[PDB]
Amino acid sequence: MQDIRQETLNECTRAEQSASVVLWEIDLTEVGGERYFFCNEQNEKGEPVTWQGRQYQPYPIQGSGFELNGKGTSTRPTLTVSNLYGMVTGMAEDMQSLVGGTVVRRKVYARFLDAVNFVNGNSYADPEQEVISRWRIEQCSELSAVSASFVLSTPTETDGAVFPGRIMLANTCTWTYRGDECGYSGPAVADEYDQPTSDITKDKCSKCLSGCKFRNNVGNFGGFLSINKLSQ
Amino acid sequence: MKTFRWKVKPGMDVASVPSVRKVRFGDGYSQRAPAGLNANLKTYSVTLSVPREEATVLESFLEEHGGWKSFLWTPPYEWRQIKVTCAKWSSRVSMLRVEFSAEFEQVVN
Amino acid sequence: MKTFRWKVKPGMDVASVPSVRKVRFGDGYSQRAPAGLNANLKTYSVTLSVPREEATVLESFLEEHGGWKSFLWTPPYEWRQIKVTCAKWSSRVSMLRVEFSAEFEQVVN
Amino acid sequence: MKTFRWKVKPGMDVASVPSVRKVRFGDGYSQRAPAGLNANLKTYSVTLSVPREEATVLESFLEEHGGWKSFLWTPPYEWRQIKVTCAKWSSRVSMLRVEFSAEFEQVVN
Amino acid sequence: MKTFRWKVKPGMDVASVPSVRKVRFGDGYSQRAPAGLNANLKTYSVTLSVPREEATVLESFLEEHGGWKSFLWTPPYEWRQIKVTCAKWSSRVSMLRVEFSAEFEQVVN
Amino acid sequence: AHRAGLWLIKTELLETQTVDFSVGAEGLRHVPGDVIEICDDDYAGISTGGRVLAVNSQTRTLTLDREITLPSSGTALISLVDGSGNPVSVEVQSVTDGVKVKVSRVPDGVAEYSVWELKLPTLRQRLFRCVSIRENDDGTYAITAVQH
Amino acid sequence: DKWALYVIGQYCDQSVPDGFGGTEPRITCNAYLTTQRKAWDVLSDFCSAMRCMPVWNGQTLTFVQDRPSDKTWTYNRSNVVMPDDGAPFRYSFSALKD
Amino acid sequence: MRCMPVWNGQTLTFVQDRPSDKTWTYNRSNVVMPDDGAPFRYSFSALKDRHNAVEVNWIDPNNGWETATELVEDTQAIARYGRNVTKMDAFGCTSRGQAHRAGLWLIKTELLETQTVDFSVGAEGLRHVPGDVIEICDDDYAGISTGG
Numbered sequence A: 001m002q003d004i005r006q007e008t009l010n011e012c013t014r015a016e017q018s019a020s021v022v023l024w025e026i027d028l029t030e031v032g033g034e035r036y037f038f039c040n041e042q043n044e045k046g047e048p049v050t051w052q053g054r055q056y057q058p059y060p061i062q063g064s065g066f067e068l069n070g071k072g073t074s075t076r077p078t079l080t081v082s083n084l085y086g087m088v089t090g091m092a093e094d095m096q097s098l099v100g101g102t103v104v105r106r107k108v109y110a111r112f113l114d115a116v117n118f119v120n121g122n123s124y125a126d127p128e129q130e131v132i133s134r135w136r137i138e139q140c141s142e143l144s145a146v147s148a149s150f151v152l153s154t155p156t157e158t159d160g161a162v163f164p165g166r167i168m169l170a171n172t173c174t175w176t177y178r179g180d181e182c183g184y185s186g187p188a189v190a191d192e193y194d195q196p197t198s199d200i201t202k203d204k205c206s207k208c209l210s211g212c213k214f215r216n217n218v219g220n221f222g223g224f225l226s227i228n229k230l231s232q
Numbered sequence B, C, D, E: 001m002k003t004f005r006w007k008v009k010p011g012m013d014v015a016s017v018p019s020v021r022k023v024r025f026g027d028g029y030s031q032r033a034p035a036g037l038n039a040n041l042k043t044y045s046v047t048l049s050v051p052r053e054e055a056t057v058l059e060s061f062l063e064e065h066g067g068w069k070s071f072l073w074t075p076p077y078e079w080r081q082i083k084v085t086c087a088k089w090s091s092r093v094s095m096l097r098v099e100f101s102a103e104f105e106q107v108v109n
Numbered sequence F: 001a002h003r004a005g006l007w008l009i010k011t012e013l014l015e016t017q018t019v020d021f022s023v024g025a026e027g028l029r030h031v032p033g034d035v036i037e038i039c040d041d042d043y044a045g046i047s048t049g050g051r052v053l054a055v056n057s058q059t060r061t062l063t064l065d066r067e068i069t070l071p072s073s074g075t076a077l078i079s080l081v082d083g084s085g086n087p088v089s090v091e092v093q094s095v096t097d098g099v100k101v102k103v104s105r106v107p108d109g110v111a112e113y114s115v116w117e118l119k120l121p122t123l124r125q126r127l128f129r130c131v132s133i134r135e136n137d138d139g140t141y142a143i144t145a146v147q148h
Numbered sequence G: 001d002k003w004a005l006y007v008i009g010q011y012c013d014q015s016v017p018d019g020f021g022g023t024e025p026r027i028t029c030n031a032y033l034t035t036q037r038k039a040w041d042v043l044s045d046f047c048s049a050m051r052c053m054p055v056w057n058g059q060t061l062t063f064v065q066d067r068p069s070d071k072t073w074t075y076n077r078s079n080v081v082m083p084d085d086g087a088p089f090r091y092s093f094s095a096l097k098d
Numbered sequence H: 001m002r003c004m005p006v007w008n009g010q011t012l013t014f015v016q017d018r019p020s021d022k023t024w025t026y027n028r029s030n031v032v033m034p035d036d037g038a039p040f041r042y043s044f045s046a047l048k049d050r051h052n053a054v055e056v057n058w059i060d061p062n063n064g065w066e067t068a069t070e071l072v073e074d075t076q077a078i079a080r081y082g083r084n085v086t087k088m089d090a091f092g093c094t095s096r097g098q099a100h101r102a103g104l105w106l107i108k109t110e111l112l113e114t115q116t117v118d119f120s121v122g123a124e125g126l127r128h129v130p131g132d133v134i135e136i137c138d139d140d141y142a143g144i145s146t147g148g
């Protein structure tokens, strides 16, 4: 049984119901982009759709091939956004910089939406009654001057998600720089080109032994400095 | 220009055909919903009769929109301003008069 | 509102086409079954004529249904109260007259 | 019931067009066979005119049979008892009398 | 030659259908743009009537171009010199005169 | 090892048949793992399930479609949808005519035109467990379930 | 679903006959996972070895344990879509050789 | 050698992978139009297929004429997008300098050249053989229209 409320459950099984509205949210905060709110419609007044006080813009967006599967997700879902005006091209310099971006899709009957979307007003308005799903972008499938379609996948599957997590490297550190495991807290030493630098904004670790030595922290190297340049 | 100022002489045919998300179950029972947030928008079959030397002004106005850029119009049906678009506007020339047979598709925005 | 209170023309169609669950390969023997409990659900192609003032009342009435939202109706065909829905209701406005062509499809719900 | 007692006043249309398996060989020559044991079954485009009071009784009979369970009939074209089925019976109401456009398909059982 | 000089009958149809960049998914919000520059080009369903003598001259003029090779023409709509092309020119021969039903499509190139 | 082995064997010997039965807009109610009962009219020929026409709270009585004939011995059950949109089930006592059935107690706010099913005491219940739900972008969901 | 997992743990901590005449905890781990495997495949092998199936709710991830569960939904002719051909439910059987 | 082999249709020739002159030009006004206004379709090489490190094979005389692999890494790229490894075999290569150069060429190719375009064009097609350098103008990519 899906995590849903009593009113949505009662609405599902009615002979005549309200509109099924889908409200998308593309977040790229974790990937260096911005947050976007979309819906494929405009309210009775022709304004952006308000839900929990959030204004999901009118924009041509849709998805196909969503499923819940209790033994995989074979055939990933596919979400498409209109590339007219080229705001999808304007999202990022390179389209594959958008991979790993999060998609929150909210399915909610129109009767539960905010009272501000109706000329008359709503007596059943409740910001609690909606179904949520979270997906990762895996690939900008294609982009034309009319439309751009992404491939999606649940965070459990995605592609970068593999168990035992940590690949053993020689001369390459995997701790996040100044992070918990790196455990370096000193002043700015060098950039990723090893060039000495007393600038705090341009100080980043080359994650190689040379960089580690600059920071003066070679104890806590996240590599295994002996193991074999080659593989197999 | 943002509004339509010519008058429909003989009357027009309006076709509603709303969107419904409809599911037919077993023993007659079913399920419907209005599908889109605003389903029924309607289209009008607007017919105009204009002098041959004047038809240029109406042609110029309809073409400057060019499918997009919806304009306000007051139909002699409901008497309310509604933004509609023009896609084809077939024209028929004679030795005295020109006849416009156009489709006006109402849009919420 | 849950009923229809308007005068019909003398000329309307009532298609029946009952639901039949029938199996037949090639053109050999065929078995036939009633399928649903509500076997024939009828379809009325109703024509209405209304004055230009009351056209707004009837148009608005059909709009708040918009395909879904079944309403009660008493057709003169059998004089029984049955639940129906409207699909298209294509309308023609004349100088003093307005003509409605609708397809009412009775429903169990 | 089992027998159709109502009279067809103007006549109907009878199309036979039987099921025939056929193979086109080379130099004009060919090969034909009757496909099934019972190929032709002679569709009848029956038209009935009934006063409005008596329309409901015919409706009850046709709708009770409802696209299965064939009934006995004597068409005024060969004058013999055949078992036949109806699927459609589209109606056509008027001020005084009602028309029925029905499709009658003869069955071997 | 590079110019069309023969006068046309009152029978002349003009359909517009300008090119648009239409983006919508389902029955939702739709974005419309002016596509290119030369949005509207218009097709003229024209009809000509000439005696039996110079019908040969007219056919040879249309055949010279033969679909490609757009020629200069001034239609009786806008009175402005445009390059158009002929697609079919279906021809009718009568006892004393002949008729030409042709499709004229204007090209920027 | 022996227990994990025996489990795989007994599943493959007892669970045989899967059913694909695309359903309507109630398809956002389910997720894989959900347990369902397929009361097929093909396997009955009596059609002991449908929708509820009216519910009388005081002197608890249900007005259904079709006909109900109580078993001569044993007490049958009637399975409804509750006010909380949940599958609760109750007993049947007496039938007036063949539509007005009498129940032990009416669950709170039993919506009219909701699904009802009669299960006889001596009958194989025939359970399935969902595996996948697909969206068809027509507000319908294709469901696959395996024998339970 | 830490709650679901807690139930599951309690179950696989049950005492069961060993097979050599002693008692024993029902399921226990003792793996040494020594390759990169796909996260979902690993998660499925865990949730197979303990009888359950992993359910990506869409929102969260839980475990539905393969047991006699109450709360059984009901489906009949009047509930599932009826296609043009009168076949609401299609069944299909595993092969004998399987 | 850094080139691609181009069957002209008459002769075989080789075009090097250099910044070449004589670059052809295309825009909305030059290429075909489908029923949907999509003059150019762009697809991108998968993140996971842009190897930033290679094990390159060659035969080493000094070691004894047997397979030795040189390893080539792009440090800054591994320092930000994880670390992908691939295997190459430089063709005639026999001195480790040659192998390292080929390795570094493959890396930079995968890392930079990301996006492909399919833009089926009109009759002008026959003047173009593989390896021809073109320029693309898109109005919805550049703001205002600047070609025609």
Ligand code: SF4
Pocket (backbone or CB within 6 Å): A173, A174, A175, A176, A177, A178, A181, A182, A183, A184, A205, A206, A207, A208, A209, A211, A212, A213, A215, A217, A218, A220, A221, A222
């Ligand atoms: S290489 Fe050293 S300084 Fe750099 S992130 Fe790793 S532990 Fe920290």
